[PDB]
Design a protein around this ligand. Structure first.
Ligand SMILES: Nc1ncnc2c1ncn2[C@@H]1O[C@H](COP(=O)(O)OP(=O)(O)OC[C@H]2O[C@@H](O)[C@H](O)[C@@H]2O)[C@@H](O)[C@H]1O
Length: 159
């Protein structure tokens, strides 16, 4: 069975075997998780472009980087975004299980730039749990907000 922890820290400082980038479909560097990932593992972005609702893995700079593209909720209906966000997390879970990845640092996809101006912490976290429950990985969820850290910890505990 998988294990879940939350850290309020820069995800670039994670101690896990792999890291999930909250990526865009074009594989460009922009504000958010992506900027921290690009600074720490700059060569991890070579050929990383992948469609919304999918994930693409690379080994670069001594790290396993999983580029997961959540939906931009400004560009899809709520129901379409919900399906695509579930799909991105399942694509992450598949990469974890098929590559025997023991531990992974994961941000909450579609909760920043792609949030469409809405609070989607619980929506994104619930899809993270559902998808990564299919793995036996040690999952560490990364955030920067003290409020988010507490709600994520509350959610982990309820399980
Ligand atoms: N370095 C970081 N470490 C940990 N958490 C972080 C970090 N940077 C941002 N976060 C948090 O991770 C969550 C996801 O943030 P985004 O990176 O904005 O993710 P998303 O909404 O999926 O959009 C990602 C996209 O932003 C675009 O600029 C860019 O193209 C990138 O692909 C947000 O709650 C944010 O507070």
């Amino acid at each position: 069975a998988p294990s879940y922890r939350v850290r309020r820290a820069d995800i670039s400082g994670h101690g896990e075997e792999a890291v999930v980038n909250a990526a865009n479909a074009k594989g460009t560097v922009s504000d958010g998780v992506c900027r921290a990932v690009a600074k720490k593992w700059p060569s991890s972005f070579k050929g990383a472009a992948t469609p919304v609702g999918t994930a693409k893995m690379i080994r670069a700079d001594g790290m396993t980087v999983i580029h997961a593209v959540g939906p931009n909720f400004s560009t899809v209906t709520e129901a379409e975004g919900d399906r695509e966000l579930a799909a991105a997390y399942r694509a992450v879970a598949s990469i974890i299980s098929t590559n025997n990845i023991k531990s992974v640092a994961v941000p909450l996809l579609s909760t920043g730039t792609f949030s469409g101006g809405k609070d989607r912490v619980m929506q994104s976290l619930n899809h993270l749990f559902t998808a990564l429950d299919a793995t036996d990985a040690d999952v560490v969820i990364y955030c920067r907000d003290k409020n988010w850290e507490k709600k994520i910890q509350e959610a982990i505990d309820r399980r």
